[PDB]
Each structure stands twice: as structure tokens, then as C-alpha cells.
Design an enzyme around this catalytic site. Structure first.
Site, mmCIF file in Angstrom:
data_model
loop_
_atom_site.group_PDB
_atom_site.id
_atom_site.type_symbol
_atom_site.label_atom_id
_atom_site.label_comp_id
_atom_site.label_asym_id
_atom_site.label_seq_id
_atom_site.Cartn_x
_atom_site.Cartn_y
_atom_site.Cartn_z
ATOM 1 N N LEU A 175 0.568 -1.309 0.231
ATOM 2 C CA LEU A 175 -0.059 -0.152 -0.260
ATOM 3 C C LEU A 175 0.831 0.930 -0.047
ATOM 4 O O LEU A 175 0.697 1.881 -1.084
ATOM 5 C CB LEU A 175 -1.306 0.123 1.533
ATOM 6 C CG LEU A 175 -1.909 -1.214 1.403
ATOM 7 C CD1 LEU A 175 -2.691 -1.630 3.107
ATOM 8 C CD2 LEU A 175 -3.201 -0.987 0.155
ATOM 9 N N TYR A 184 10.866 2.131 6.842
ATOM 10 C CA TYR A 184 10.693 1.292 8.258
ATOM 11 C C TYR A 184 10.035 0.576 8.076
ATOM 12 O O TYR A 184 9.641 -0.458 9.415
ATOM 13 C CB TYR A 184 9.821 2.279 8.876
ATOM 14 C CG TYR A 184 8.505 2.817 8.405
ATOM 15 C CD1 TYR A 184 8.899 3.709 7.115
ATOM 16 C CD2 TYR A 184 7.429 2.216 9.029
ATOM 17 C CE1 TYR A 184 7.136 3.906 6.941
ATOM 18 C CE2 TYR A 184 6.394 2.817 7.729
ATOM 19 C CZ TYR A 184 6.622 3.452 6.657
ATOM 20 O OH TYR A 184 4.899 3.954 6.608
ATOM 21 N N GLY A 185 9.763 0.051 6.904
ATOM 22 C CA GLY A 185 9.217 -1.246 6.678
ATOM 23 C C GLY A 185 7.878 -0.636 5.446
ATOM 24 O O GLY A 185 8.931 -0.743 4.380
ATOM 25 N N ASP A 207 2.577 16.237 12.145
ATOM 26 C CA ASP A 207 2.747 15.689 11.433
ATOM 27 C C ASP A 207 1.123 15.275 10.037
ATOM 28 O O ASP A 207 1.141 14.512 9.522
ATOM 29 C CB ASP A 207 4.066 14.030 10.817
ATOM 30 C CG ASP A 207 4.292 14.007 9.856
ATOM 31 O OD1 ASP A 207 5.069 15.365 8.950
ATOM 32 O OD2 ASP A 207 4.930 13.493 9.610
HETATM 33 N N1 LIG Z 1 0.810 4.584 10.462
HETATM 34 C C1 LIG Z 1 -0.626 4.184 9.469
HETATM 35 C C2 LIG Z 1 -1.356 3.862 8.503
HETATM 36 N N2 LIG Z 1 -2.784 3.078 9.588
HETATM 37 C C3 LIG Z 1 -3.895 2.475 8.290
HETATM 38 C C4 LIG Z 1 -3.705 2.814 7.070
HETATM 39 N N3 LIG Z 1 -1.972 2.832 6.242
HETATM 40 C C5 LIG Z 1 -0.593 3.819 7.212
HETATM 41 O O1 LIG Z 1 -0.034 3.956 6.360
HETATM 42 C C6 LIG Z 1 -0.190 5.364 5.819
HETATM 43 C C7 LIG Z 1 0.964 6.091 5.051
HETATM 44 C C8 LIG Z 1 0.700 4.627 4.252
HETATM 45 C C9 LIG Z 1 0.267 5.214 2.701
HETATM 46 C C10 LIG Z 1 -0.966 4.872 2.452
HETATM 47 O O2 LIG Z 1 -1.526 3.579 2.343
HETATM 48 C C11 LIG Z 1 -2.783 3.102 2.101
HETATM 49 C C12 LIG Z 1 -2.532 3.131 0.393
HETATM 50 C C13 LIG Z 1 -3.850 2.876 -0.203
HETATM 51 N N4 LIG Z 1 -3.930 2.624 -1.848
HETATM 52 C C14 LIG Z 1 -2.431 2.165 -2.582
HETATM 53 C C15 LIG Z 1 -3.170 1.907 -4.290
HETATM 54 C C16 LIG Z 1 -4.526 0.808 -4.352
HETATM 55 C C17 LIG Z 1 -5.025 0.974 -5.379
HETATM 56 N N5 LIG Z 1 -4.554 2.183 -6.643
HETATM 57 C C18 LIG Z 1 -3.905 3.062 -5.933
HETATM 58 C C19 LIG Z 1 -2.635 3.205 -4.769
HETATM 59 C C20 LIG Z 1 -4.887 2.107 0.051
HETATM 60 CL CL1 LIG Z 1 -6.166 2.077 -0.278
HETATM 61 C C21 LIG Z 1 -5.189 2.328 1.749
HETATM 62 C C22 LIG Z 1 -3.798 2.774 2.987
HETATM 63 N N6 LIG Z 1 -3.649 2.727 3.834
HETATM 64 C C23 LIG Z 1 -4.318 1.704 4.460
HETATM 65 O O3 LIG Z 1 -5.475 1.129 4.101
HETATM 66 N N7 LIG Z 1 -4.677 1.995 6.432
#
Ligand SMILES: N#Cc1ncc2nc1OCCCCCOc1cc(NCc3ccncc3)c(Cl)cc1NC(=O)N2
Length: 268
Positions: free
Chosen positions: A14, A19-20, A129
Site C-alpha cells: 500500500l 521503516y518497513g 505530521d
Molecule cells: N500509520 C499508519 C497507517 N494506518 C492505516 C493505514 N495506512 C497507514 O499508513 C499510512 C502511510 C501509508 C501509505 C498509505 O497507505 C494506503 C494506500 C492505499 N492505496 C494504494 C493504492 C491502491 C490502488 N491503486 C493505487 C494505489 C490504500 Cl487503498 C490504503 C492505505 N492505508 C490503509 O488502508 N491503512
């Protein structure tokens, strides 16, 4: 005695960084879906007091405009923070470069952002942030605040502590963090919500950093609103931005006063 769900398969990436990364995960049974932040506690200095502090704060949280914490697993030395999955993606990706998005949409997102921040500040927590990449849209396209890796507690026992530490993402950071030793935490978050607003409405950030050594920032202090991105923002929300993007954090509009703002209360 009931085995089958809590064993997650890493379905896809995603967003990975230094950091991973974060992985969409599906339970091999319940079919439940979640976001999993992968992080190796390598060594002991930039982790023993980093990822742990993040888990600590996630546990305090519980609001509809804040990504949910479903626990974590630290089996060996890899950390898996089970976090709420928001299939809507990042607010960053709904912002059309150099255009932004329909004002009504921006206004709705801003309300949800304000509700989330109002929530956090009320429980004495500061995110430090706030940016489009940290703001996600759930399945209903509603905004939720995420990543509390840099967040901290500034009030409690009904007593406010002051900050001084310089963290965050430059373009989105408030001036006091660059010219002051100490400062109230709340005013900084507000300033950043103001930059996100600019981006949603203009599809571009105003400056590289808030310093008199930055022309774009100087032009702002000089009220050159005929200059981009301001010229692309209707007078109503621009007037609100004028209240939020104030250098003196003491003269900066508080959240209770933003809710009293015209554009803010305007039916769009
Ligand atoms: N700390 C923290 C944290 N907690 C919960 C989540 N992310 C975190 O991290 C935030 C920085 C994460 C980068 C964003 O992440 C994501 C990127 C994409 N798109 C990807 C995509 C899907 C389909 N087409 C294009 C791109 C989707 Cl659909 C969901 C998330 N993130 C989440 O569902 N949950």
C-alpha cells in the site's frame, strides 16, 4: 477452542518507506481485511523509543475520524501493527495536481479533519505530521487521521506541557518550529490543517518552507494573494486561510474559532 481467524496473508503493498511498509491483509478465514505496518526494530535507538511510543498512543485513540488500532505482534524482532484498512486510499490521490478538487468535497474533508484534530487535542494528543499522505479515505470516502509515529501527549491531568522538538514535513510545518525554542502544540496542528486545505483547494503547496528566506512565504506575509495558489482559491476559504496561516502562533485562529468561520459553516 476456536481456530481459523487471526492468521493474515499479506495481499499487497500500500505504501512502503524507510521503516518497513504497510500491507493490505486478509484473514485466512473470517476474510476480515486490515492494514499492517511492517517494521523491523533493527538495533536499538531509532526504534526502542519510536514504534513503541506509536503503539502507546494508538491505544488511547478511539474516534470515527481516526484510523483504528487492532493490536500488534512482536514475535521476534519484526513489528506488525494491525491498523484499520481504508480502501479509499490517501487524500493525496484525490488532489488533482495544480487543480485540487471541487470546493464542496474539500469542505467536507476539512470538517472531518477538524473533527479528528478537535478529538485529538481534547485528549491532549498532538499528531505533529498532518499531511495528505497521512489522511486516508475509508470505504465510505470519509477522512480518517493516521500514522501517529511522530505524535505525542502535551496535556493531561488538565496541565499543558510545551514542545520544542523539530519534527514533521517541511512544507507543512509551522514557523515557530524553525524560529522558536518552545511552543504550544495545538497551534502547529492547526497551521498544518491550513496547508492541507490550500492543497485540496489549489492542488499545490504554497511554499517549500515557512521562512523569510522563502519568496513564496514572504509574498504570503505581504498579502500577494493575486499570486498562485491563492488566486485559485475563492475569497471565502481564502479568508479562512488568512486566519490559519498566521506566523505568530498566539494570534493564530483556534479550532473553536474556525468552526465559527463563514466558509466553514457555508452550505455547499
Ligand atoms: N500509520 C499508519 C497507517 N494506518 C492505516 C493505514 N495506512 C497507514 O499508513 C499510512 C502511510 C501509508 C501509505 C498509505 O497507505 C494506503 C494506500 C492505499 N492505496 C494504494 C493504492 C491502491 C490502488 N491503486 C493505487 C494505489 C490504500 Cl487503498 C490504503 C492505505 N492505508 C490503509 O488502508 N491503512
Amino acid at each position: 477452542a476456536v481456530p481459523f481467524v487471526e492468521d493474515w496473508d499479506l495481499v499487497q503493498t500500500l505504501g512502503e518507506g524507510a521503516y518497513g511498509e504497510v500491507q493490505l491483509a486478509v484473514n485466512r478465514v473470517t476474510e476480515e481485511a486490515v492494514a499492517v505496518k511492517i517494521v523491523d526494530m533493527k538495533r536499538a535507538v531509532d526504534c526502542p523509543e519510536n514504534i513503541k511510543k506509536e503503539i502507546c498512543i494508538n491505544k488511547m485513540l478511539n474516534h470515527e475520524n481516526v484510523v483504528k488500532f487492532y493490536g500488534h505482534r512482536r514475535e521476534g524482532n519484526i513489528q506488525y501493527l494491525f491498523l484499520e484498512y481504508c480502501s479509499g486510499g490517501e487524500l493525496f490521490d484525490r488532489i488533482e495536481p495544480d487543480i485540487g478538487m471541487p470546493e464542496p468535497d474539500a469542505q467536507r474533508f476539512f470538517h472531518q479533519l477538524m473533527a479528528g484534530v478537535v478529538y485529538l487535542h481534547g485528549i491532549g494528543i498532538t499528531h505533529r505530521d498532518i499531511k495528505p499522505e497521512n489522511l486516508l479515505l475509508d470505504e465510505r470516502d470519509n477522512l480518517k487521521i493516521s500514522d501517529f509515529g511522530l505524535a505525542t501527549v502535551f496535556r493531561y491531568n488538565n496541565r499543558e506541557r510545551l514542545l520544542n522538538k523539530m519534527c514533521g514535513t517541511l512544507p507543512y510545518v509551522a514557523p515557530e518550529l524553525l524560529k522558536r525554542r518552545e511552543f504550544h502544540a495545538e497551534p502547529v496542528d492547526v497551521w498544518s490543517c491550513g496547508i492541507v486545505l490550500t492543497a485540496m483547494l489549489a492542488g499545490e503547496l504554497p511554499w517549500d518552507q515557512p521562512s523569510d528566506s522563502c519568496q513564496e512565504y514572504s509574498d504570503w506575509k505581504e498579502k500577494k494573494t493575486y499570486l498562485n495558489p491563492w488566486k485559485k482559491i475563492d475569497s471565502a476559504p481564502l479568508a479562512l486561510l488568512h486566519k490559519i496561516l498566521v506566523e505568530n502562533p498566539s494570534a493564530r485562529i483556534t479550532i473553536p474559532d474556525i468552526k465559527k468561520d463563514r466558509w466553514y459553516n457555508k452550505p455547499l
